[PDB]
Enzyme design. Structure first.
Site, PDB file in Angstrom:
ATOM      1  N   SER A   1       0.733  -1.204  -0.007  1.00 34.91           N
ATOM      2  CA  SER A   1       0.038  -0.103  -0.080  1.00 34.91           C
ATOM      3  C   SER A   1       0.729   1.276  -0.388  1.00 34.91           C
ATOM      4  O   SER A   1       0.382   2.244  -0.575  1.00 34.91           O
ATOM      5  CB  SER A   1      -0.962   0.033   1.363  1.00 34.91           C
ATOM      6  OG  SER A   1      -0.194  -0.154   2.444  1.00 34.91           O
TER       7      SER A   1
ATOM      8  N   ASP B   1      -3.178 -10.993   6.595  1.00 35.79           N
ATOM      9  CA  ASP B   1      -2.484 -11.088   7.898  1.00 35.79           C
ATOM     10  C   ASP B   1      -1.509 -12.206   7.645  1.00 35.79           C
ATOM     11  O   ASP B   1      -1.981 -13.362   7.900  1.00 35.79           O
ATOM     12  CB  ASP B   1      -3.257 -11.293   9.154  1.00 35.79           C
ATOM     13  CG  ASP B   1      -2.610 -11.274  10.277  1.00 35.79           C
ATOM     14  OD1 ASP B   1      -1.125 -10.844  10.236  1.00 35.79           O
ATOM     15  OD2 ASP B   1      -3.166 -11.636  11.417  1.00 35.79           O
TER      16      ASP B   1
ATOM     17  N   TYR C   1      17.933  -3.375  13.540  1.00 36.15           N
ATOM     18  CA  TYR C   1      18.235  -3.123  12.355  1.00 36.15           C
ATOM     19  C   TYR C   1      19.419  -4.465  11.564  1.00 36.15           C
ATOM     20  O   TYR C   1      18.836  -5.257  10.839  1.00 36.15           O
ATOM     21  CB  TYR C   1      18.857  -2.064  11.738  1.00 36.15           C
ATOM     22  CG  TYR C   1      19.244  -2.147  10.181  1.00 36.15           C
ATOM     23  CD1 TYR C   1      18.380  -2.095   9.227  1.00 36.15           C
ATOM     24  CD2 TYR C   1      20.561  -2.298   9.942  1.00 36.15           C
ATOM     25  CE1 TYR C   1      18.930  -2.414   7.928  1.00 36.15           C
ATOM     26  CE2 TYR C   1      20.925  -2.431   8.563  1.00 36.15           C
ATOM     27  CZ  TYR C   1      20.104  -2.254   7.761  1.00 36.15           C
ATOM     28  OH  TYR C   1      20.316  -2.504   6.399  1.00 36.15           O
TER      29      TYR C   1
ATOM     30  N   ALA D   1      19.928  -7.094  13.791  1.00 36.34           N
ATOM     31  CA  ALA D   1      19.460  -8.756  13.943  1.00 36.34           C
ATOM     32  C   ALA D   1      18.492  -9.019  12.913  1.00 36.34           C
ATOM     33  O   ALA D   1      18.629  -9.898  12.616  1.00 36.34           O
ATOM     34  CB  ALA D   1      18.784  -8.409  15.619  1.00 36.34           C
TER      35      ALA D   1
ATOM     36  N   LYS E   1      18.360  -7.973   9.736  1.00 35.45           N
ATOM     37  CA  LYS E   1      19.178  -8.274   8.515  1.00 35.45           C
ATOM     38  C   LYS E   1      19.878  -9.618   8.716  1.00 35.45           C
ATOM     39  O   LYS E   1      20.069 -10.374   7.834  1.00 35.45           O
ATOM     40  CB  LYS E   1      20.151  -7.078   8.504  1.00 35.45           C
ATOM     41  CG  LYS E   1      20.948  -7.412   7.077  1.00 35.45           C
ATOM     42  CD  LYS E   1      21.966  -6.299   6.726  1.00 35.45           C
ATOM     43  CE  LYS E   1      22.963  -6.214   7.865  1.00 35.45           C
ATOM     44  NZ  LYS E   1      23.862  -4.955   7.420  1.00 35.45           N
TER      45      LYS E   1
ATOM     46  N   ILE F   1      16.368   4.861   2.802  1.00 38.59           N
ATOM     47  CA  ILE F   1      15.399   4.925   1.497  1.00 38.59           C
ATOM     48  C   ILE F   1      14.400   5.943   2.076  1.00 38.59           C
ATOM     49  O   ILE F   1      13.963   6.175   3.077  1.00 38.59           O
ATOM     50  CB  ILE F   1      14.719   3.668   1.164  1.00 38.59           C
ATOM     51  CG1 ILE F   1      15.498   2.525   1.153  1.00 38.59           C
ATOM     52  CG2 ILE F   1      13.974   3.953  -0.087  1.00 38.59           C
ATOM     53  CD1 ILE F   1      16.633   2.566   0.212  1.00 38.59           C
TER      54      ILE F   1
HETATM   55 CL1  LIG Z   1      18.492 -12.629  16.511  1.00 37.74          CL
HETATM   56  C1  LIG Z   1      17.109 -13.750  15.940  1.00 37.74           C
HETATM   57  C2  LIG Z   1      16.183 -14.001  16.469  1.00 37.74           C
HETATM   58  C3  LIG Z   1      15.434 -15.219  16.119  1.00 37.74           C
HETATM   59  C4  LIG Z   1      15.632 -15.682  14.785  1.00 37.74           C
HETATM   60  C5  LIG Z   1      16.706 -15.461  14.013  1.00 37.74           C
HETATM   61  C6  LIG Z   1      17.519 -14.551  14.800  1.00 37.74           C
HETATM   62  N1  LIG Z   1      18.612 -14.192  14.142  1.00 37.74           N
HETATM   63  C7  LIG Z   1      19.133 -15.035  13.158  1.00 37.74           C
HETATM   64  N2  LIG Z   1      20.126 -14.720  12.589  1.00 37.74           N
HETATM   65  C8  LIG Z   1      20.472 -15.530  11.500  1.00 37.74           C
HETATM   66  N3  LIG Z   1      19.721 -16.561  11.112  1.00 37.74           N
HETATM   67  C9  LIG Z   1      18.602 -16.685  11.953  1.00 37.74           C
HETATM   68  N4  LIG Z   1      17.667 -17.606  11.502  1.00 37.74           N
HETATM   69  C10 LIG Z   1      17.991 -18.525  10.541  1.00 37.74           C
HETATM   70  C11 LIG Z   1      16.867 -19.421  10.389  1.00 37.74           C
HETATM   71  C12 LIG Z   1      15.789 -19.099  11.542  1.00 37.74           C
HETATM   72  C13 LIG Z   1      16.744 -18.004  12.167  1.00 37.74           C
HETATM   73  N5  LIG Z   1      18.243 -16.009  12.939  1.00 37.74           N
END
Ligand SMILES: Clc1ccccc1Nc1ncnc(-n2cccc2)n1
Ligand SMILES: Clc1ccccc1Nc1ncnc(-n2cccc2)n1
Ligand code: NI
Lengths: 236, 236, 236, 234
Positions: free
Chosen positions: A16, A64, A143, A145, A147, A176
């Protein structure tokens, strides 16, 4: 042609505003039938109007991504009237719950649309990461985490589905020009621009162009990748 | 009397190491996208071949002789290009050496010096035009084993760090610097395919499509990036 | 322990280098610290004596093959083969020369000391990265580039020498309390501390303690690693 | 290097790497509470600590249950003091990683109150050992390691201002129960990918953990230290 998405159905969540809208318009311009989603009926109507205003076939729907019922229902509805969506763009203290919830939603939606892609032996799933705004620590923490979660997830899902000629990729936006970022204090904006080699904000269209390329046939050997689109500013 | 509607129309692109494989495929793709293409080789016979290929495929441009390891050759070839064809504002560095020309350090060092030499030479033209694209092509996953994995990882790490740093140095001038990291590209065979999620080798054309995108206006906010194009097989 | 082992620490006259020489000495090594000047070397010898450490200070130019060869021979003559070696000796566009020069020196020294380590089938090479020295942008570019070069180099050399029970590792300091860092305005200081989760600068001793662990027998399965020691502030 | 005067909680301490960590922390002078999922595992932990002259205890803990975590912590405070050092050692890829991170978060978040009060702390997360695999094994392993790195880095940011460090250790191929019993072909292949040309010992992981728990590692946080003899997997 190598860039035509003619004959394909693309689902774009969170379509949207801003980046999501720009992605829907770009996929449409490339000839896809586009289903953009929002969380509210008013958002969905807006999506439909925008698509029409820009000459794009498709629809706006309410979705959702956190609810199995909503996902299942929306997909059924899409198959009913429009065909299987073979292009899917996921755009829809606190860091742990955020990332966890986002990944559960990515997995929910991805897993639901894979049947259709598995049948067609062809597919594109593209995950859009969150934009860079907030400062000091807590915004950098969220940010980085988000990523990191996005990269790991994208890489793993790509491995699981690769044999079926389905590619799974991600786009990691930097700073952006969007609703959140237009509102930001002058000091924040200045600090941020100082960290960006291009010395400017990205446009939402510049994210959409990357998504459009990845959705094409030319990107067919690209998978498990996170393409950063951030004007040269990198932040882990 | 005939203007192409292709995304790099009106641009001059230099592609080093264009006589075979990935380099040839990049020259053809840039040309297909409407650029005037200058492909280079280290020998007169390679250059003659490049010219014939471009002609056979309806691409305007030329094949020239260039040694990326010599400042004289680089300076001379650039001057020649300006003389007859215009400033090249798209530059693809593909001509990297290997250990066939202990071994990892000299290879990577030599390759980065050549990247820096050429990039630094073409920047004046790009700086004047306030626009540019430099794209660096990493080495194909070559040897099977240990010394091969060391060379490959070292070359890729050098390529990423270099690309990221140069992007910072030239960003303020609307010049983007990016890299493409190829995996296993086609130009015991069952073992290999088992290590690749897509279950197939990449075509040289699939690298060329990624380079073509990055050279476009749509990739303008993408810089400092290394896009892996490896069918989902990652090796550091 | 490090007892009776001979450790060479380059750039040992000030700050981090001095702290490393003292820590290795405290752990019972015979320490040879180096400087580029006779006055630096005398100072090193006095410091070691003042702190009850056996060893010496010598003059060494890591950029010259003669100086390296000569200094090594001298060390073997009087003290034994150095089996622990710590390499500590090292606007937007000075990055390439810096990194290049630093890697050539790391390679030169490392390659020279390997014969002794290869004969002893035991060794420790530890590379110290640069502190965040200058600031703003060109300082962030230099820092990130140097660190990327350090990680790739360290990782590759570790592969080359592993079969001989020689480990190669690196330490990546963040903001350490030094001459450059003591001198910046109060606003600078406050901003910086805001980027560091621990909310303080590192002490040189805190780098030395990491080096000392890596030189030990307990770190024998750790190799190719870069241990960041930066209070939680990451910048690539 | 002294951990004298500190209480260390080491989950999954009955075998291999976990046991070696409990012994190393103990040797450095900590009071050590090792945990297992069963009463027999806990009894074993207590015997091993005793045999090696280490004060502490073995107890039963399920890191997947809030009740168990809360109860075990209360129990530790009851009899021994607040643990200021915590080592977390305790289709398919998504549920595994998700569950592991939820357990890391559950335990870490519980012990933080004690660390926040003491304005001092060490949380150290041990990744999984390599190689129980197919391709699904490489996917699980890479996913788990990525989750571990990101998680460790984020939590470190959240708790840094309190002089609590959060780090991780990423083991490669280590000589353990699971790895001794792996098909010989797997073992040979793996050994071929390791520059040191040998398996790591569990003690070599423990030494890294011990250092990171010390005062000398106080400026190290958000780090994942790989301990893998030079073999790196992406
Ligand atoms: Cl910090 C965190 C919290 C919940 C789920 C993932 C993360 N961090 C993170 N960093 C790299 N890979 C993954 N991940 C990969 C498959 C499921 C979670 N997770
Ligand atoms: Cl010389 C070398 C050998 C093995 C691996 C890397 C390098 N060099 C290197 N590695 C990473 N980054 C960089 N870099 C960044 C700017 C210039 C060089 N250089
Ligand atoms: Ni209906």
């Amino acid at each position: 042609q190598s860039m035509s998405l003619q004959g394909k159905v693309a689902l774009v969540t969170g379509a949207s505003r801003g980046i999501g809208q720009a992605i829907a318009l770009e996929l449409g311009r490339l000839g896809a039938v586009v289903i953009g989603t929002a969380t509210s009926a008013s958002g969905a109507e807006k999506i439909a109007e925008t698509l029409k205003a820009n000459g794009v076939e498709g629809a706006g729907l309410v979705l959702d991504v956190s609810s199995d019922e909503s996902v299942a229902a929306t997909l059924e509805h899409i198959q009913q009237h429009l065909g299987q969506p073979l292009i899917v763009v996921n755009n829809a203290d606190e860091w742990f719950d955020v990332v966890n919830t986002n990944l559960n939603s990515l997995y929910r939606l991805s897993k639901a649309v894979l049947r259709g892609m598995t049948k067609a032996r062809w597919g594109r799933i593209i995950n859009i990461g969150s934009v860079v705004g907030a400062m000091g620590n807590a915004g950098q923490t969220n940010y980085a985490a988000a990523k990191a979660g996005l990269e790991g997830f994208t890489r793993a899902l790509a491995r699981e589905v690769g044999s079926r000629a389905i590619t799974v990729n991600a786009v990691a936006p930097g700073f952006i020009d969007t609703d959140m970022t237009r509102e930001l204090p002058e000091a924040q904006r200045e600090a941020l621009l100082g960290q960006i080699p291009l010395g400017r904000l990205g446009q939402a269209e510049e994210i959409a162009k990357v998504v459009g390329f990845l959705a094409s046939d030319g990107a067919a050997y690209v998978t498990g990748a996170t393409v950063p689109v951030n004007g040269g500013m990198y932040m882990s």
